[PDB]
Amino acid sequence: GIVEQCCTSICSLYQLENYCN
Amino acid sequence: FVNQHLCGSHLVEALYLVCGERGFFYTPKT
Ligand code: NA
Ligand code: NI
Numbered sequence: 001g002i003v004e005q006c007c008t009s010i011c012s013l014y015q016l017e018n019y020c021n
Numbered sequence: 022f023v024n025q026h027l028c029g030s031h032l033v034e035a036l037y038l039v040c041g042e043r044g045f046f047y048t049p050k051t
Contacts, residue, residue, distance in 0.1 A: 003049040006035075007028035013039050014022075019048070020040035 002019060005011050027035050036045045 001048060001050055003032060003047070006025055006032050010024040010026050012022065012024050013035070016025075016036055016039045019036060019045050021044040021046065 002011060002015060005015075025035060033047055036047060039045075
């Protein structure tokens, strides 16, 4: 998931925004 | 914005900045 993707690869702030409430 | 390499607590800092007062969920694999 996003926690693993951001750390093993890279991720964008727009991907992170999907986890806001 | 630029892409990110974020592990551990650095990812939660990034979620905090992105989401602000909307809040967020931090949901690692188990
Ligand atoms: Na970005
Ligand atoms: Ni560190």
